[PDB]
């Protein structure tokens, strides 16, 4: 077998779907070649690493194997590496087209020690005539302030719904899969922006149950069913909600964190109730979540959360 | 001092705490003692019981040979559990001489007593899981915690649970009478039970309060029985007369009078916020208020105590509590 | 000025004869001195009592002390330092400069001082800013070393101290000086400083307006003597510090005008007050008591004021950005008063 | 080799000492110290000439990142015609390696400086050394014994030794306490940076709105390299400043709109879209929402809830979101709490007090106030470290009580006694170990009716000169 | 000699109970030979470790000591460990190995985000020469990438039939008699963790083995577990709902003192009891749940015990007024 996320990974910059502004920025960068040092920040699985990889590929053409140094969390990045190997790579003579430059792609820059990030400063400041640096990070706060200021910051928003839907439809058309609209909406729901997780859940559903259907997705996700949680959060009499939470969710060994997270996610999408009541229900569920994370996970906390949600809905 | 010179070295001297310990008394002669987690209020006997058990089981030879006493004074990071705790959970048994087996049967396992595990990080507790599962046959673990909700549940599923009831406010008066008569201290009639109640939860606090009261009374050369006032003045609890003044002021009074009185109190009176406890006791044990009043009183007192728990200001919370209790 | 009239012995004390008698009693046992926990309002002179007790036990040379700096490495790779003022017989640890590393420094320093071998004294200032982990480490240190480290800790409102620590130490309190005794000390000061008083009513007036805080009373007497040319008459416009006047002007602006157009300037004044080394809790307490002092409000408004003040004081003690909670409290106050 | 393919920061680097924008005073101080270092060496570094800058061997540069410290140091060393022997973080500056490499060259001469030009009478310092230790703060864990060895290098040296760091008051930088002179580079003002950006823009044949330039200079928090690097992005025009550069402003503009939270608009813009709008920038959105949530004319008010109640509930939710953010930053592994924070600090107050913007969206100011509070707390901590020997108080009660009367005793004589009270003033200053800088710091911490920045300059400058020249003769410790 | 927790540990796939839905799947995976990376997650005391060790011993037989590497949580777990040990074990190919190795990471939810990123990159790199198996208690503290990379397996708690079968097998192989209500109270208090059951069984064995014939009554089980008996809960609730303030306070105090009861478990039992009452109104239930949750949250921080007890009594009383 073969993972779809690995098989259908975009190799050309145009195939990347998502942020429309920064992808066009990188398109013009590859068209010109004068790429500056850049940090790329954003939430996981929204197309950070693939973006910089495609950029380097399209920018260097046939010389990618000789003019690119990649360093992820697997490779050793301490003090000796940044002082010896990176410095000897930056000085390496290489005759490229007039606009191109050697590229150093540092993925998961957050794991790089601050003391290790110190050494990179003069190494990237001095040899900026034949070497450019591209950091890829989740949180741009763990990068030291000097490196934070030396390079251009590129933020990647979380994926919307129409973009993930378009990508999934492309994948289905290329793979000739049987599906339905409710299944795709369930994929969008369980993904919430993670293109990688969306594609993986799609492939797992197709491999396990063949047909992309709501019950199949909700049986392969191992998460509480969104319909039953919505019924819990929308029952008229409180005892019905308490009985639902007791018998249908608490007995089957679900983790309280998962229950609160699913309630949060379904309350976000309840497009039938008003907006203010949604915000207040989210506030209550979030207070209950903060209580849960502090060490107490008794059923009484979820019962009180449901009670307060009903008190608000009345 | 007195708190340590009359410390019980055997599990028989203790009389208030005899429920949880007994099972160990049944299994002391065997080598299959399960991993134990003591929990409860401080100053209960946990340290006393573990040291008495080590004295009755090991002896002076092996008291410090295969026992590792770790406290919050020692380094509580992952460094210790990696370097020394893991090394000591594996080390072999040491038998230096023959004067130990005469009075104490030595088991082939060992005991490590990791105290104050309440404030331990989750990663350190996951490491404790490994170091307890890998040497469960040759090494036994003793844990101490004041709050069970902080220590993670997978550990409590492995280690057996033991609670030490705070204190017995009925029979310990005889123990304190014995201590007083052997110390030849002349106290009043109704002071011993008062010393015990004001020191609720702890007994070490009780004996140290008795010691302080005696050492303060014997300075005057008065030769009279030390009354409850001298004890309540050293325990930090609020006197009863100023408490009656407070409750009369809050029973009938406007905002300005209450404000001025609490200003005077927080300025020159007893600077503690333990007056909430005294107010709760007085309002609960009283029989002159209806139920709908006592319900709101208990709720308001609980709210004020929960707010004071977070280390906030004393004056503002006390004034708010008294104003809200005056609104009824 | 004030430090020029600071007692240097228990006999030189001129206040709380009960307390000095009890300390003379306790100083009769230099070989066995239990741990002491002094608690009482600010400016009562607890540090004076402690240093006088030290001078009574040790030599009078305990007052000539030298400052020192000590830097150490933590479990991680951070090497941080603190400043301890030490004497030939005692040392004063003030775990306030460091934010969260209290436990490591207290553990290391106490364990290092407890291996010098007749004992040594460790004075812990601001014993309420100690994290519970640091407090537990201190209690275990007390449990281990008891023949070289006799702890004396001064603090105020000793609620954030766990009962495991209260049990071992002797609880001593220092009540604020009554207005009569404050007036007596002020009279002694103006006598030894030959200040031309027109009457003795100014002393009682200062004692009343000082709220039982001895040191601020002495210091405001100092501040007023340099504005009347050492001739204090009956017409004395009592001088308040700058921040108190700013807080009172803020209170008057809150009472007189109730709108967001004034809430903007209120936030500006809060920013200006905070950025000049002023805590949040002090601002909140002063603003609350000032708003309660105003005579135009009824009892319901005052009850709402004190309730919101309590809630936002808890939230200030739980949060980290004080401007948010202060602006929220003032907004709720303006809402209720509207 | 190409004029274009170089970055915009290296291509537009300063060349002289009149293009360095901001901090002219510190540059002139460094230049006048380096020029007179020769005569200071002649006098064995014991005669402090007219500035107290004749006894120090090493100069130390510090300040926020992106101001020109490295550029100023290099240009100052080059103008005098010296030879720059530079070592930085990328070199292993251990104790043994420093003793081997640099220590043997503290007093030697240069070969390249000799052979470059030695025949024409330009300047006699063409062959001397100027050792620049850049990023001394960057001494990581792999450089053992570096800070102490450099502190020892400060003394016993024979050539100008410039040092550069980013945080002077860091404990690791303590061994440089009094053994070297230290000047400070502040964040440049908006006028000089605006002039430099205008020069660059007209030089690159493109114009921008001055308001956009002001917003940029505000966002970058004074960093010049950062704003230049962000401006270089214009070539790759409202889309540029709308999407990439001025993103938090547009986030605040979209969130505070009144048409979104309406029933007609909410059906087109879901709540998930607003949470994504927050997630766009989760570092500046809470502060931006808190700064200007009370400067809009609302339109979503309830029938019976005025503006004040709405702003009060918004501030309550802001406080709750602040508590949630603190709980999050207590342990990063709880990033799952990030969406909840999203609704508390960001979405809820905006939805509560949405409407139409009255004026213009003002950038957040909490960062500058936090920096000012940190600086003043450092200064007060130093003052207490000095004065603790004779005050018997805590670091916070000092500012509360003692500072007003201290300011009175230290200044008010200068208002009524004229200038003969200096012998008394220093007397008080001799009792509390204070210095002239301590006097300035004490004079600084005052707000309200007792503002001193206006009053300080009213006294005659002759009194200041006399006080300074009289304090120089005595020393208390 | 060794404890029952270590003795009765299963050694084959047949000796696991109440997990057939996963056992058939792992048997399909072992007969197919296409065993991918696995994630086993669930509540403690369920059989994840036992199942994976039995599966490894079945697949590799005697080569288990060579091709199976077990790693636990925070074994000096910097990025350096994942860079050296796991990476060498994955990359290095044995001399006479056919197939792939197995690296089992026990309690691997205590890894930092950087450590989990290193692990996901490693598993991505050498996914052709070895397969991994990650064990977890909470599947919400793992990076979604590592979760998506492998196949999930949730371990639902042990049902009543499985635990009853296991305690029967333990009973027939030991010298103990068990009363009818004993197993009922056992299953009610254990909540479905086999480890706690095997611990408490040997505990009460060593506790009441005086004549080698005593019967384990519910008293000794409630003592060894440290849990209250439902009769005391009903009695204290009755006293609170019927008597006055002083008598109810004294009753609560004596019940929580003479037996050693924590307010947390007492509140759990009280709300469990109140869950099945026929309350006529609704506001009572809402106020009750809210106030009781607040009491539990406040107890979680260790306030003043008597104050929280009086607050519990006041909430229960003031809730039942309609
Ligand atoms: N916009 C996109 N279009 C198509 N595929 C995408 C997109 N974004 C993510 N993916 C898929 O997600 C997979 C995961 O790779 P990346 O997105 O590069 O991971 P990442 O963004 O670096 O997140 P990390 O590594 O956890 S910080 C890729 O192999 C793609 O198949
Ligand atoms: N049940 C008891 N009977 C007699 N003396 C006791 C008892 N409990 C405590 N003591 C006395 O108190 C001291 C022992 O108390 P500890 O065992 O330290 O209490 P503790 O609960 O272990 O406190 P911790 O756990 O360190 S917070 C000795 O001086 C004993 O004499
Ligand atoms: N005053 C200035 N005017 C114009 N450009 C400046 C100025 N200061 C810095 N720069 C720019 O910044 C580049 C050099 O950066 P520096 O500010 O010298 O670095 P730095 O001051 O050492 O700060 P670090 O190294 O990050 S701590 C120059 O080439 C310019 O592009
Ligand atoms: N399904 C089961 N069938 C039979 N015995 C079991 C079962 N689950 C657990 N046990 C017994 O309980 C012991 C503990 O099992 P473990 O596999 O260690 O539990 P676990 O799944 O690893 O949960 P942890 O380690 O606390 S996260 C085993 O050695 C068995 O004796
Ligand atoms: N008995 C006394 N006689 C004269 N002055 C006193 C007496 N007690 C206290 N003081 C004065 O009170 C001032 C403040 O006391 P201090 O211990 O500094 O308060 P804090 O505990 O707030 O630091 C001291 O400067 C001292 O001069
Ligand atoms: Mg990546
Ligand atoms: Mg103990
Ligand atoms: Mg630099
Ligand atoms: Mg396991």
UniProtKB/Swiss-Prot annotation, chain A:
Key word DNA-binding present: yes
GO molecular function: ATP binding; ATP hydrolysis activity; DNA binding
Subcellular location: Nucleus
Listed InterPro entries: AAA+_ATPase, ATPase_AAA_core, DNA_pol3_clamp-load_cplx_C, DNA_Rep/Repair_Clamp_Loader, P-loop_NTPase, Rep_factorC_C, RFC_lid
Annotated signal sequence range: none
CDD domains registered for this protein in UniProt: AAA, HLD_clamp_RFC
Keyword Nucleotide-binding: yes
Binding site for ATP: 5, 17, 42-50, 138, 196
GO annotation terms (biological process): DNA damage checkpoint signaling; DNA repair; DNA-templated DNA replication; leading strand elongation; mitotic sister chromatid cohesion; sister chromatid cohesion
Keyword terms, alphabetized: ATP-binding, Cell cycle, DNA replication, DNA-binding, Nucleotide-binding, Nucleus
Pfam families from the UniProt entry: AAA, Rep_fac_C
TM spans (from-to): none
Gene Ontology CC: one annotated term: nucleus
Role this protein plays: Component of ATP-dependent clamp loader (RFC and RFC-like) complexes for DNA clamps, such as the POL30/PCNA homotrimer and the checkpoint clamp DDC1:MEC3:RAD17 complex. During a clamp loading circle, the RFC:clamp complex binds to DNA and the recognition of the double-stranded/single-stranded junction stimulates ATP hydrolysis by RFC. The complex presumably provides bipartite ATP sites in which one subunit supplies a catalytic site for hydrolysis of ATP bound to the neighboring subunit. Dissociation of RFC from the clamp leaves the clamp encircling DNA.
PANTHER family in the record: REPLICATION FACTOR C / DNA POLYMERASE III GAMMA-TAU SUBUNIT, REPLICATION FACTOR C SUBUNIT 2
Additional notes on this entry: Present with 2760 molecules/cell in log phase SD medium.
Protein name: Replication factor C subunit 4
From Swiss-Prot, chain C:
Protein's gene: RFC5
Protein name: Replication factor C subunit 5
Family: Belongs to the activator 1 small subunits family.
SUPFAM superfamilies: P-loop containing nucleoside triphosphate hydrolases, post-AAA+ oligomerization domain-like
Subunit structure, as described in the record: Replication factor C (RFC) is a heteropentamer of subunits RFC1, RFC2, RFC3, RFC4 and RFC5 and forms a complex with POL30/PCNA in the presence of ATP. Component of the RAD24-RFC complex which consists of RAD24, RFC2, RFC3, RFC4 and RFC5 and associates with the checkpoint clamp DDC1:MEC3:RAD17 complex. Component of the ELG1-RFC complex which consists of ELG1, RFC2, RFC3, RFC4 and RFC5. Component of the CTF18-RFC complex, which consists of CTF18, CTF8, DCC1, RFC2, RFC3, RFC4 and RFC5. RFC5 interacts with ECO1.
Keyword ATP-binding included in the entry's annotation: yes
Species this protein is from: Saccharomyces cerevisiae (strain ATCC 204508 / S288c)
Stretches of the chain forming a coiled coil according to its record: none
Extra information: Present with 5040 molecules/cell in log phase SD medium.
Record-level Gene Ontology MF annotations: ATP binding; ATP hydrolysis activity; DNA binding
Top-rank taxon: Eukaryota
Family annotation (SMART domains): AAA (SM00382)
Binding site for ATP: 2, 14, 40-48, 215
GO biological process: DNA damage checkpoint signaling; DNA repair; DNA-templated DNA replication; leading strand elongation; mitotic sister chromatid cohesion; sister chromatid cohesion
Subcellular location: Nucleus
Pfam families registered for this protein in UniProt: DNA_pol3_delta2, RCF1-5-like_lid, RFC_C
Keywords from the named record: ATP-binding, Cell cycle, DNA replication, DNA-binding, Nucleotide-binding, Nucleus
Swiss-Prot record, chain D:
Binding site for ATP: 9, 21, 63-71, 166
Keywords, sorted A to Z: ATP-binding, Cell cycle, Cell division, DNA replication, DNA-binding, Nucleotide-binding, Nucleus, Phosphoprotein
Superkingdom, natural source: Eukaryota
GO molecular function annotations of the record: ATP binding; ATP hydrolysis activity; DNA binding; DNA clamp loader activity
Compartments, record wording: Nucleus
Gene Ontology biological process terms from the UniProt entry: cell division; DNA repair; DNA-templated DNA replication; leading strand elongation; mismatch repair; mitotic cell cycle
GO cellular component, one term: DNA replication factor C complex
Chief location category: nucleus
Subunit relationships: Replication factor C (RFC) is a heteropentamer of subunits RFC1, RFC2, RFC3, RFC4 and RFC5 and forms a complex with POL30/PCNA in the presence of ATP. Interacts with ECO1 and POL30/PCNA.
Annotated family: Belongs to the activator 1 large subunit family.
UniProt miscellaneous comment: Present with 2360 molecules/cell in log phase SD medium.
Function: Component of the ATP-dependent clamp loader RFC complex for the POL30/PCNA homotrimer DNA clamp. During a clamp loading circle, the RFC:clamp complex binds to DNA and the recognition of the double-stranded/single-stranded junction stimulates ATP hydrolysis by RFC. The complex presumably provides bipartite ATP sites in which one subunit supplies a catalytic site for hydrolysis of ATP bound to the neighboring subunit. Dissociation of RFC from the clamp leaves the clamp encircling DNA.
Annotated protein name in UniProt: Replication factor C subunit 1
Natural source organism: Saccharomyces cerevisiae (strain ATCC 204508 / S288c)
Swiss-Prot record, chain E:
Family recorded in the similarity comment: Belongs to the activator 1 small subunits family.
Key words, A-Z: Acetylation, ATP-binding, Cell cycle, DNA replication, DNA-binding, Nucleotide-binding, Nucleus
Record-linked InterPro entries: AAA+_ATPase, ATPase_AAA_core, DNA_pol3_clamp-load_cplx_C, DNA_Rep/Repair_Clamp_Loader, P-loop_NTPase, Rep_factorC_C
SMART domains, A to Z: AAA (SM00382)
Residues involved in ATP binding: 5-9, 17, 42-50, 137, 195
Transmembrane domains' residue ranges: none
GO molecular function: ATP binding; ATP hydrolysis activity; DNA binding
Compartments it resides in: Nucleus
Annotated protein name in UniProt: Replication factor C subunit 3
Subunit-level organization: Replication factor C (RFC) is a heteropentamer of subunits RFC1, RFC2, RFC3, RFC4 and RFC5 and forms a complex with POL30/PCNA in the presence of ATP. Component of the RAD24-RFC complex which consists of RAD14, RFC2, RFC3, RFC4 and RFC5 and associates with the checkpoint clamp DDC1:MEC3:RAD17 complex. Component of the ELG1-RFC complex which consists of ELG1, RFC2, RFC3, RFC4 and RFC5. Component of the CTF18-RFC complex, which consists of CTF18, CTF8, DCC1, RFC2, RFC3, RFC4 and RFC5. RFC3 interacts with ECO1 and POL30/PCNA.
GO biological process entries: DNA damage checkpoint signaling; DNA repair; DNA-templated DNA replication; leading strand elongation; mismatch repair; mitotic sister chromatid cohesion
Lineage: Eukaryota, Fungi, Dikarya, Ascomycota, Saccharomycotina
Any GO CC annotation of this UniProt entry: nucleus
Domain of life according to the entry: Eukaryota
A matching Pfam family: Rep_fac_C
Additional comment: Present with 3140 molecules/cell in log phase SD medium.
């Amino acid at each position: 077998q073969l993972p779809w996320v690995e098989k259908y990974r975009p190799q050309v910059l145009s195939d990347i779907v998502g942020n429309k502004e920064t992808i066009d920025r990188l398109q013009q960068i590859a068209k010109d070649g004068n790429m500056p040092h850049m940090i790329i920040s954003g939430m996981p699985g929204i197309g950070k690493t693939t973006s910089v990889h495609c950029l380097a590929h399209e920018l260097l053409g046939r010389s990618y194997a000789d003019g690119v140094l990649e360093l992820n969390a697997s490779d050793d990045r301490g003090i000796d590496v940044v002082r010896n190997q990176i410095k000897h790579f930056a000085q390496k003579k290489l005759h490229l087209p007039p606009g191109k430059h050697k590229i150093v792609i540092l993925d998961e820059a957050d794991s790089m020690t601050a003391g290790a990030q110190q050494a990179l400063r003069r190494t990237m400041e001095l040899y900026s005539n034949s070497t450019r640096f591209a950091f890829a990070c989740n949180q741009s706060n763990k990068i030291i302030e000097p490196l934070q200021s030396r390079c251009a910051i590129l933020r990647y928003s979380k994926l919307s719904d129409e973009d993930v839907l378009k990508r999934l439809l492309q994948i289905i058309k290329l793979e000739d899969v049987k599906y339905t609209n409710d299944g795709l909406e369930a994929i969008i729901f369980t993904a919430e922006g993670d293109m990688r997780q969306a594609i993986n859940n799609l492939q797992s559903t197709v491999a396990g149950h063949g047909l992309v259907n709501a019950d199949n997705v909700f049986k392969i996700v191992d998460s509480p069913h969104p319909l039953i949680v919505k019924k819990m959060l929308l029952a008229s009499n409180l005892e019905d909600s308490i009985q639902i939470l007791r018998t249908d969710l608490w007995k089957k060994g679900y983790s309280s964190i998962d229950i609160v997270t699913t309630s949060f996610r379904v309350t976000k999408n309840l497009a039938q109730v008003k907006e203010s009541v949604r915000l207040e229900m989210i506030k209550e569920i979030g207070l209950t979540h903060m209580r849960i994370l502090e060490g107490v996970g008794t059923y009484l906390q979820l019962a009180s959360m449901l009670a307060k949600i009903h008190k608000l809905n009345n | 001092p007195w708190v340590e010179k009359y410390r019980p070295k055997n599990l028989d001297e203790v009389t208030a705490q005899d429920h949880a310990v007994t099972v160990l008394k049944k299994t002391l002669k065997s080598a299959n003692l399960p991993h134990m987690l003591f929990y409860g209020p401080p100053g209960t006997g946990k340290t006393s019981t573990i040291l008495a058990l080590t004295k009755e089981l090991y002896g002076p030879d092996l008291m410090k040979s295969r026992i590792l006493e770790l406290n919050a004074s020692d380094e509580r990071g992952i460094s210790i559990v990696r370097e020394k705790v893991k090394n000591f959970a594996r080390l072999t048994v040491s038998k230096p001489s023959k004067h130990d087996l005469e009075n104490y049967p030595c088991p082939p396992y060992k005991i490590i007593i990791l105290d104050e595990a309440d404030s331990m990080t989750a990663d350190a507790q996951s490491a404790l899981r490994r170091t307890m599962e890998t040497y469960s046959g040759v090494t036994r673990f003793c844990l101490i915690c004041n709050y069970v909700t902080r220590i993670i549940d997978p550990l409590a599923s492995r280690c057996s649970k033991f609670r030490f009831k705070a204190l017995d406010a009925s029979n310990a008066i005889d123990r304190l009478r014995f201590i007083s008569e052997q110390e030849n201290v002349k106290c009043d009639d109704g002071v011993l039970e008062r010393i015990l109640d004001i020191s609720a939860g702890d007994l070490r606090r009780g004996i140290t309060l008795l010691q302080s009261a005696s050492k303060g009374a014997q300075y005057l050369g008065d030769g009279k029985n030390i009354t409850s006032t001298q004890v309540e003045e050293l325990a930090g609890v609020v006197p009863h007369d100023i408490l009656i003044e407070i409750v009369e002021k809050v029973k009938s009074g406007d905002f300005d009078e209450i404000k001025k009185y609490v200003n005077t109190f927080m300025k020159s009176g007893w600077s503690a916020a333990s007056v909430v406890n005294q107010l709760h006791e007085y309002y609960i044990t009283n029989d002159n208020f209806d139920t709908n009043f006592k319900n709101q009183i208990s709720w308001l007192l609980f709210t004020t105590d929960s707010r004071l728990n977070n280390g906030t200001n004393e004056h503002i919370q006390l004034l708010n509590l008294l104003v809200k209790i005056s609104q009824l | 000025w004030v430090d020029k009239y600071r007692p240097k012995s228990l006999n030189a004390l001129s206040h709380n004869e009960e307390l000095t008698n009890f300390l003379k009693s306790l100083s009769d046992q230099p070989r066995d001195l239990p741990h002491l926990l002094l608690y009482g309002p600010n400016g009562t002179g607890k540090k004076t009592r402690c240093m006088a007790l030290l001078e009574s036990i040790f030599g009078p040379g305990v007052y000539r002390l030298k400052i020192d700096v000590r830097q150490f490495v933590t479990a991680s790779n951070r090497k941080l330092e603190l400043n301890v003022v030490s004497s030939p017989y005692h040392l004063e640890i003030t775990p306030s400069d460091m934010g969260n590393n209290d436990r490591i420094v207290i553990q290391e320093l106490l364990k290092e001082v407890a291996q010098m071998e007749r004992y040594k004294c460790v004075i812990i200032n601001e014993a309420n800013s100690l994290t519970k982990d640091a407090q537990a480490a201190l209690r275990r240190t007390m449990e281990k070393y008891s023949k070289n480290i006799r702890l004396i800790m001064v603090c105020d409102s000793m609620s954030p101290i766990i009962a495991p620590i209260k049990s071992r130490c002797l609880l001593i309190r220092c009540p604020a000086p009554s207005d009569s005794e404050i007036s007596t000390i002020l009279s002694d000061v103006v006598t030894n400083e030959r200040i031309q008083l027109e009457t003795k009513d100014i002393l009682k007036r200062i004692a009343q307006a000082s709220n039982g805080n001895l040191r601020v009373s002495l210091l405001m007497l100092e501040s007023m003597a340099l504005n009347n040319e050492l001739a204090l008459k009956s017409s004395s416009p009592i001088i308040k510090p700058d921040w108190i006047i700013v807080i009172h002007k803020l209170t008057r602006k809150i009472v007189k005008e109730r709108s967001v157009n004034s809430l903007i300037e209120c936030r500006a004044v809060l920013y200006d007050l905070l950025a000049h080394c002023i805590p949040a809790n002090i601002i909140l307490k002063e603003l609350t008591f000032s708003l309660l002092d105003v005579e135009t409000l009824n009892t319901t408004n005052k009850s709402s004021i004190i309730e919101y003040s309590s809630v936002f004081d808890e939230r200030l003690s739980l949060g980290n950005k004080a401007i948010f909670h202060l602006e929220g409290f003032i907004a709720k106050v303006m809402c209720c008063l509207d | 080799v190409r004029e274009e393919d170089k970055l915009w920061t290296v291509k537009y680097a300063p060349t002289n000492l009149q293009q360095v924008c901001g901090n002219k005073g510190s540059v002139m101080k460094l230049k006048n110290w380096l020029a007179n270092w020769e005569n200071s060496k002649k006098n064995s570094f014991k005669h402090a000439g007219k500035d107290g800058s004749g006894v120090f061997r090493a100069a130390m540069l510090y300040g926020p990142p992106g101001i020109g410290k490295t550029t100023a140091a290099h240009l100052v060393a080059q103008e005098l015609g010296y030879d720059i022997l530079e070592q930085n973080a990328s070199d292993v500056r251990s104790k043994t390696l420093l003793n081997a490499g640099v220590k043997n060259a503290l007093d030697n001469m240069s070969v390249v400086g000799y052979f470059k030009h030695n025949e024409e009478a330009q300047n006699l310092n063409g062959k001397h050394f100027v050792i620049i230790m850049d990023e001394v703060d960057g001494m990581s864990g792999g450089d053992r014994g570096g800070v102490g060895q450099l502190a020892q290098f400060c003394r016993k040296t024979s050539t100008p030794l410039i040092l550069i760091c980013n945080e002077r008051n860091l404990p690791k930088m303590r061994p440089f306490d009094r053994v070297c002179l230290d000047i400070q580079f502040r964040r440049p003002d908006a006028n000089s940076i605006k002039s430099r950006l205008m020069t660059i823009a007209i030089r690159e044949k493109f114009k921008l709105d001055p308001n956009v330039i002001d917003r940029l200079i505000q966002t970058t928090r004074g960093d010049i390299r950062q704003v230049i690097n962000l401006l270089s992005t214009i070539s790759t025009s409202k889309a540029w400043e709308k999407n990439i550069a001025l993103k938090p402003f547009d986030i605040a503009h979209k969130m505070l709109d009144g048409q979104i939270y309406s029933d007609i608009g909410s059906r087109n813009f879901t709540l998930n879209d607003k949470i994504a709008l927050y997630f766009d920038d989760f570092d500046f959105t809470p502060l931006m929402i808190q700064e200007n949530y009370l400067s809009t004319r609302p339109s979503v008010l309830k029938p019976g809830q005025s503006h004040l109640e709405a702003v009060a509930e918004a501030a309550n939710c802001i406080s709750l979101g602040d508590i949630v953010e603190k709980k999050i930053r207590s342990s990063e592994q709880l990033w799952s709490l990030l969406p909840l924070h999203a609704v508390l600090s960001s979405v809820y107050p905006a939805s509560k007090v949405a409407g139409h913007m009255a004026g213009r969206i003002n950038f957040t100011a909490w960062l500058g106030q936090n920096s000012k509070s940190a600086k003043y707390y450092r200064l007060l901590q130093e003052i207490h470290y000095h004065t603790r020997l004779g005050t018997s108080t805590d670091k916070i009660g000092l500012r509360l009580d003692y500072l007003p009367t201290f300011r009175k005793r230290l200044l008010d004589p200068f208002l009524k006694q004229g200038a003969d009270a200096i012998s008394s003033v220093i007397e008080v200053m001799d009792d509390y170990y204070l210095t002239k800088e301590d006097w300035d710091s004490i004079m600084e911490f005052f707000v309200g009716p007792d503002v001193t920045t206006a009053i300080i300059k009213k006294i005659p400058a002759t009194v200041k000169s006399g006080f300074t020249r009289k304090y120089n003769s005595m020393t208390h410790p | 000699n060794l404890p029952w927790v270590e003795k009765y540990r299963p050694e084959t796939l047949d000796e696991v109970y109440g997990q057939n839905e996963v056992i058939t799947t792992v048997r399909k995976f072992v007969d197919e030979g296409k065993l991918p990376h696995l994630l086993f997650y669930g509540p403690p005391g369920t059989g994840k470790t036992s199942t994976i060790v039995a599966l490894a011993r079945e697949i590799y037989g005697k080569n288990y000591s060579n091709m199976v590497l077990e790693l636990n949580a925070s074994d000096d777990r910097g990025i350096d460990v994942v860079r050296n040990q796991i990476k060498d074990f994955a990359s290095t190919r044995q001399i006479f190995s056919k197939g792939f190795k197995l690296i089992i990471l026990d309690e691997a939810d205590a890894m930092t985000n950087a450590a989990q990123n290193a692990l996901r990159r490693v598993i991505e790199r050498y996914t052709k020469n070895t397969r991994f198996c990650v064990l977890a208690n909470y599947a919400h503290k793992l990076t979604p990438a590592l979760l998506s990379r492998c196949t999930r397996f949730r371990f639902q708690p042990l049902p009543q039939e499985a635990i009853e079968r296991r305690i029967a097998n333990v009973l027939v192989h030991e010298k103990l008699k068990l009363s009818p209500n004993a197993e009922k109270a056992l299953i009610e208090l254990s909540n479905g963790d086999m480890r706690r059951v095997l611990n408490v069984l040997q505990s009460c064995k060593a506790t009441l083995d005086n004549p080698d014939e005593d019967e384990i009554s519910d008293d000794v089980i409630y003592e060894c577990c440290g849990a209250p008996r439902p009769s005391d809960l009903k009695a204290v609730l009755k006293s609170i709902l019927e008597d006055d303030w002083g008598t109810a306070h004294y009753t609560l105090n004596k019940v929580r003192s003479a037996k050693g009861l924590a307010l947390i478990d007492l509140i759990e039992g009280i709300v469990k009891i109140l869950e099945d009452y026929e309350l006529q109104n609704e506001e009572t239930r809402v106020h009750l749940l809210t106030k009781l949750a607040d009491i539990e949250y406040s107890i979680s921080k260790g306030g003043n015990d008597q104050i929280q007890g009086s607050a519990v009594i006041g909430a229960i009383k003031a809730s039942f007024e309609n």
